[PDB]
């Protein structure tokens, strides 16, 4: 997990549309139906990837956790104001592209992606360097 | 051996089969008799 030194502790809640694009090693996943995504899901992800790639294959990470998440009580009646944290979601609106080479050749990239992105809340699609981009 | 979803073919010689709204995967090996229905 990660997110150290936030400057606040109660972000609101929005979400609707945006994103990024390119592969950065060239087999990355990319989300379709957009959602929060907590760090737990990430440890599960990069672990499924790792253990499938000979426990060391090269996984660029990707997105990263930020907005705090909280239920607040235990079942206590709401009234008091909003506090505590336990989730720490990153937001992934569609088109965000998780970055996952491993030089691991062809299918294993694909398959490790199958597991990994299937260890996650949202339906996803597998892609790589393709329609390209350039500027300066 | 109902697994009522999944059904991923594994005996590899395995046959897949629809029939009466079901998807039995019949294999020459008995173990693989998966049935999502």
């Amino acid at each position: 997990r990660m997110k150290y030194r936030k400057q606040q502790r109660g972000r609101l809640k929005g979400a609707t549309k945006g994103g990024d694009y390119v592969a950065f090693g060239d087999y990355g996943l990319v989300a379709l139906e957009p959602a929060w995504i907590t760090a737990q899901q990430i440890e599960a992800a990069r672990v499924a990837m790792v253990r499938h790639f000979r426990r060391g294959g090269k996984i660029f990470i990707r997105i990263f956790p930020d907005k705090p998440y909280t239920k607040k009580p235990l079942e206590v009646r709401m009234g008091k104001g909003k506090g505590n944290v336990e989730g720490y979601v990153a937001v992934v609106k569609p088109g965000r592209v998780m970055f996952e080479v491993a030089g691991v050749t062809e299918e294993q990239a694909m398959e490790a992606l199958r597991i990994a992105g299937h260890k996650l809340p949202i339906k996803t699609k597998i892609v790589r360097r393709d329609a390209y981009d350039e500027a300066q | 051996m109902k697994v009522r979803a999944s059904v991923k073919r594994i005996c590899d010689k395995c046959k897949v089969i629809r029939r009466h709204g079901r998807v039995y995967v019949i294999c020459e090996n008995p173990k693989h008799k998966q049935r999502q229905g």
């Binding site: 009580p73 235990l74 079942e75 206590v76 009646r77 | -």
Partner: protein, 289 residues
């Protein structure tokens, strides 16, 4: 194994049949001699049932024991080993076990299926000579451990070869091999420990068995004591007994998640305070033998 009463007319001789007496192991129930189980799987059951519903009373049925001839630095080797004399490895090295080499006469191909079974305790071949006379039958010789051949060798060997040929040990020439130690750490005060030998690391398939005894009705209010298999390294198994507790929060059926929170500390803080006075005293009651 008797449970209790020793001697009691050591009915050994009786009438013919590979009799047995004396030479009993201790560990945690002496029981004097542990013989009375020669020949096939019948002579043992028959005799055991004989004095049972004939003369003898409620007897035991423990398995076989060993010796272990460790080699403690500055002289040791033997030192008379006992299912409790475990002096750790401070005795320098080990070298204790009866590596007897028997001659199996398996013909046809009973070897293939048997050769794998003989691996009960890391065995090996010595002289593989094709029997003469003609064919059918055969021969076999290994160096298994008399400790891994005593109990469960014939009834299992006869099934692997349809029950053909025979088998006879030689009990000659000692050996070292891995042994290890396994002691069941009940609650946390450690008692008897039972253990075994850990020779070659076998407690595993036995640890998660002897320990996870479900706890002989040892709940004690709400001790929750965890029964772990303390052999000789941190922890091997992990058997924790269930506590008791009381439907404390069963009268405040109302609102406010604060009320049901108070009637929870008295039960949580208390359960711990108890984990000090008494521990666990559940030995008898038909041990998990």
């Amino acid at each position: 194994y008797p449970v209790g009463k020793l001697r009691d007319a050591l009915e050994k001789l009786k009438l013919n049949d590979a009799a047995l007496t004396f030479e009993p192991e201790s560990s945690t129930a002496l029981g004097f001699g542990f013989r009375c189980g020669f020949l096939g799987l019948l002579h043992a059951e028959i005799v055991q049932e004989r004095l049972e519903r004939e003369f003898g009373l409620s007897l035991i049925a423990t398995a076989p024991s060993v010796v272990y001839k460790v080699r403690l630095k500055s002289g040791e080797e033997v030192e008379v080993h006992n299912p409790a004399d475990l002096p750790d490895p401070t005795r320098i090295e080990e070298i204790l076990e009866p590596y007897v080499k028997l001659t199996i006469f398996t013909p046809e191909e009973y070897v293939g299926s048997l050769m794998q079974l003989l691996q009960e305790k890391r065995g090996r071949l010595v002289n593989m000579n094709y029997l003469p006379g003609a064919q059918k039958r055969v021969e076999l010789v290994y160096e298994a451990p008399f400790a891994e051949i005593l109990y469960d060798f014939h009834d299992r060997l006869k099934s692997v070869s349809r029950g053909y040929a025979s088998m006879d040990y030689e009990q000659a020439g000692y050996r070292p091999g891995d042994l290890v130690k396994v002691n069941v750490l009940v609650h946390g005060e450690v008692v008897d420990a039972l253990t075994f030998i850990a020779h070659r690391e076998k407690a595993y398939t036995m640890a998660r068995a002897i320990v996870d005894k479900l706890a002989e009705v040892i709940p004690r209010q709400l001790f929750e004591v965890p029964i772990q298999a303390a052999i000789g390294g941190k922890i091997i198994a992990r058997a924790t007994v269930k506590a008791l507790r009381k439907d404390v929060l069963a009268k405040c059926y109302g609102g406010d998640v604060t009320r049901k929170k108070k009637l929870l500390e008295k039960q949580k803080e208390g359960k711990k305070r108890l984990k000090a006075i008494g521990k666990v005293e559940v030995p008898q009651e038909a041990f998990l033998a």
